[PDB]
Ligand binder design. Structure first.
Ligand SMILES: *[C@@H]1O[C@H](CO)[C@@H](O[C@@H]2O[C@H](CO)[C@@H](O)[C@H](O)[C@H]2NC(C)=O)[C@H](O)[C@H]1NC(C)=O
Lengths: 49, 45
């Protein structure tokens, strides 16, 4: 078997029926970004004379 | 005052009230997803 994605030559066998040199690759990306915030302010004043 | 006597009355009263409340709201959020399929190993880059 010739050079496929490797060294000069490989060696097959009688029991092995096939050696294949087809390239396929799958990828995935699932990015999620969250950011919450809270800001509460309360003030009171009372003066009597 | 009339002959003969003297009377004086003074009354003072003041009030003041003030209240202030402030609240602010701000938030951001975003998501991004992706999928791919690509058919040597150098192409994995
Ligand atoms: C959290 O909120 C911030 C918003 O202030 C998001 O990104 C910020 O982007 C500004 C843009 O210049 C940067 O200066 C800040 O440094 C960023 N925030 C941080 C914490 O680095 C951010 O995407 C939100 N979500 C997170 C951090 O998960």
């Amino acid at each position: 078997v010739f050079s496929g994605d490797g060294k000069d030559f490989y060696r097959l066998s009688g029991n092995v029926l096939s050696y294949t040199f087809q390239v396929k690759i799958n990828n995935d990306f699932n990015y999620e970004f969250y950011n919450s915030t809270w800001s509460y302010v309360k003030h009171t004043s009372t003066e009597h004379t | 005052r009339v002959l003969f006597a003297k009377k004086t009355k003074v009354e003072h009263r003041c009030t003041t009230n003030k209240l202030s409340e402030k609240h602010e709201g701000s938030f951001i959020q975003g998501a991004e997803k992706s999928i791919s399929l690509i058919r040597s190993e150098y192409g994995a880059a």
